[PDB]
From a paper:
In this study, we structurally characterize the interaction of the broadest and most potent MPER-targeting antibody, 10E8, with viral membrane lipids and scaffolded MPER and propose how 10E8 approaches the MPER-viral membrane epitope during neutralization. The membrane proximal external region (MPER) of Env is one of its most conserved regions and, hence, the focus of vaccine and therapeutic design efforts. To aid in characterization of the complete 10E8 epitope consisting of MPER and lipids, we designed an epitope-scaffold that presented the MPER on a stable framework in the 10E8-bound conformation derived from previous crystal structures.
Overall, mutants 1 to 3 were constructed to coat the presumed membrane-interacting surface of 10E8 with different amounts of negative charge to investigate binding affinity and specificity of the 10E8 epitope (protein and lipid) and to examine the effects of the mutations on neutralization potency. X-ray structures of mutants 1–3 and 5 were determined in complex with the T117v2 scaffold at 1.6 Å (mutant 1) and 2.0–2.2 Å (mutants 2, 3 and 5) resolution. Superposition of the Cα atoms of the variable domains of mutants and wild-type 10E8 shows nearly identical conformations (Cα r.m.s.d. of 0.40, 0.23, 0.31 and 0.39 Å for mutants 1, 2, 3, and 5, respectively). Although mutant 1 has a slightly larger r.m.s.d. 10E8 and mutant 1 showed the presence of three major peaks in each sample. Thus, our results suggest conformational isomerization for both 10E8 wild type and mutant 1.
Author numbering:
A (entry chain H): 1 to 52, 52A, 52B, 52C, 53 to 82, 82A, 82B, 82C, ...
B (entry chain L): 3 to 9, 11 to 95, 95A, 95B, 95C, 96 to 212
C (entry chain O): 11 to 165
The structure:
């Protein structure tokens, strides 16, 4: 029925500018109020602002931290909503949602201007504000030993260190080895660079005769690294 | 603004009420939203007693004084999520605001302690004049852990980076923590430990610079 | 502001139906260009789903209206009924409301809608004013509503 699709999110340096769009379908857009909402990494939903309809002269209201930097607009002929963002900050990073906005007022218990509620949401577009430059990762072996061996199985892996931006991919033995593989979500470091690890659990009995190579690929930097992980035999 | 409990835990199938409080609620109703990772928020309830078509009847909103409440009558495993309140930021305002959110943990399986693996710096990294300790944490439930690093026995805060927990495909949780140090710092202590605390209990792993 | 003119007030005879009332009050609004030509149809349909009967203690009051998209310019139209006509309760009550005073609201935006609804809720708490509406001629009703509207606008 109702379809909302945000786009335009991407990487931008602090002080930079970005324009987000949202296509709307399945409802009477021209008369609909529309709201932008964002969710910073790890934080909660934050109301960004809302544009009204023709009877309100398409007035817009903004949250205090974005007033003057952000501009909300609409194009009714093709059912689009926009958010133009200037002088972007680190704190502006996150997932930006567009929402169809209903209005509520209970006659007997209500107080003007009633309440706005968000009846349909898109899935969001991701905005990343960072001063980091593109960088391919360094890849280091995480060797198995007695310390990472439990009851017939050993853990080994690769450390994929200091890359930007996301994502990287990791396979093992060119994809011949998939059972027991766990690639952990990356950490974002205070440097602005990412690091992650990929581990595989394997039989400890065959560490002496099996070869384990992790295949790391970082598309944004055209980086390809193969790293053999050798056992410590202790 | 609007204040919600940071987190609330509920046993499977039990009734739970979460709250949202603020001066604006004395004049304005709240609306309620469910938010799951990677999914769009869903409106659950708004106004005096409006539930959208398609929202299960076990979700109900109420209001008293300067508080709004969302009650889930008989929490399901799938109700484990973030819940947000929204209303006017001040009485008569044209702006809107969200509460800080409440993480509702619905306890849907037994407690599971984390499996912890700690790796020392590789010879390769050290040869590159760098050193990283890698602490990998998996298969724990519920999805919250505390990670502390020790150099010998003294706490280390400098150079520590730790991820938020993430749900694995087997519905338990994983996280990782990294300690960056110099080769000289690594060699200067007798041991380093990664201490992972989960539901009050700690799993500890230790590595020694001189040991195999 | 709210347009409120002398011909936006009228008394209605017996044997008028709810729909007839809506059409009669919408008529001067349509003729002055305050609302879209099929405004009455939209108020009728909204009344079917969101009833506007108010059980206040002199006599019943109704506040028929529809969505802001069908209003061109803010206006109010008033009707006094010769005999009570039933409107369903605006609060989801089983008992219908015997109404004799009808305030047709034609507001073209949300902020004006809610402000006028708040004001109406205050006005109908004046039992004596409501009683006066049942006896005053069209001229006196116009002057009294006009003055109250202008006072609402001041602040």
């Amino acid at each position: 029925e109702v379809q909302l699709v945000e786009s335009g999110g991407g990487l931008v340096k602090p002080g930079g500018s970005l324009r987000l769009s949202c296509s709307a379908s399945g409802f009477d857009f021209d008369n609909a109020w529309m709201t932008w909402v964002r969710q910073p990494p790890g934080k909660g939903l934050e109301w960004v602002g809302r544009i009204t309809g023709p009877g309100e002269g398409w007035s817009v209201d903004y949250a205090a931290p974005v007033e003057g930097r952000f501009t909300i607009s609409r194009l009714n002929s093709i059912n689009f909503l926009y958010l133009e963002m200037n002088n972007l900050r680190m704190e502006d990073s996150g997932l930006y949602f567009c929402a169809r906005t209903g209005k509520y007022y209970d006659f007997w218990s209500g107080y003007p201007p009633g309440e706005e509620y968000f009846q349909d949401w898109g899935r969001g577009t991701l905005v990343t504000v960072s001063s980091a430059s593109t960088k391919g990762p360094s890849v280091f072996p995480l060797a198995p030993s007695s310390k990472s061996t439990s009851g017939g199985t050993a853990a080994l892996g690769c450390l994929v260190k200091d890359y930007f931006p996301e994502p990287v991919t990791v396979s093992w033995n060119s994809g011949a080895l998939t059972s027991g593989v766990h690639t952990f979500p990356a950490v974002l470091q205070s440097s602005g660079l990412y690091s992650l690890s990929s581990v595989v659990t394997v039989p400890s009995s065959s560490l002496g005769t099996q070869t384990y190579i992790c295949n790391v690929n970082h598309k944004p930097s055209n980086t390809k690294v193969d790293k053999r992980v050798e056992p410590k035999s202790c | 603004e609007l204040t919600q409990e940071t987190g609330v835990s509920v046993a499977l199938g039990q009734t739970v009420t979460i709250t949202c409080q603020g001066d604006s609620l004395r004049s304005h109703y709240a609306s309620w939203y469910q938010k799951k990772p990677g999914q769009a928020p869903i409106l659950l309830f708004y106004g005096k007693n409006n539930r959208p078509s398609g929202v299960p009847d076990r979700f109900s909103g109420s209001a008293s004084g300067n508080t709004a409440s969302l009650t889930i009558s008989g929490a399901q495993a799938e109700d484990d999520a973030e819940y947000y309140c929204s209303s006017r930021d001040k009485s008569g305002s044209r702006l809107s605001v969200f509460g800080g959110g409440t993480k509702l943990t619905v306890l849907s399986q037994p407690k599971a302690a984390p499996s912890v693996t700690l790796f020392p710096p590789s010879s390769e990294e050290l040869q590159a004049n760098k050193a990283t300790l890698v602490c990998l944490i998996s298969d724990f439930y519920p999805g919250a852990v505390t990670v502390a690093w020790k150099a010998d026995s003294s706490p280390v805060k400098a150079g520590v980076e730790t991820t938020t927990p993430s749900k694995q495909s087997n519905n338990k949780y994983a996280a990782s923590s990294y300690l960056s140090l110099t080769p000289e710092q690594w060699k200067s202590h007798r041991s380093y430990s990664c201490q992972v605390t989960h539901e009050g209990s700690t799993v500890e792993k230790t590595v020694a610079p001189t040991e195999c | 502001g709210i347009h409120f003119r002398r011909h936006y007030v009228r008394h209605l005879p017996k044997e008028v139906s709810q729909n007839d009332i809506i059409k009669a009050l919408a008529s001067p609004l349509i003729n002055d260009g305050m609302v879209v030509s099929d405004f009455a149809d939209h108020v009728i349909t909204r009344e079917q789903n969101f009833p506007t009967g108010l059980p206040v203690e002199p006599v019943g009051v109704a506040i028929p209206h529809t969505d802001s998209k069908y209003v061109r310019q803010n206006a109010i139209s008033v009707g006094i009924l010769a005999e009570p006509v039933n409107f369903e309760d605006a609060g989801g009550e089983p008992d219908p409301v015997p109404v004799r005073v009808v305030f047709m609201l034609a507001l073209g935006n949300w902020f004006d809608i809610t402000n006028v609804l708040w004001w109406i809720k205050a006005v109908i708490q004046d039992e004596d004013f409501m009683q006066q509406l049942l006896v005053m001629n069209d001229d006196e009703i116009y002057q009294s509503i006009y003055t109250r509207i202008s006072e609402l606008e001041h602040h």
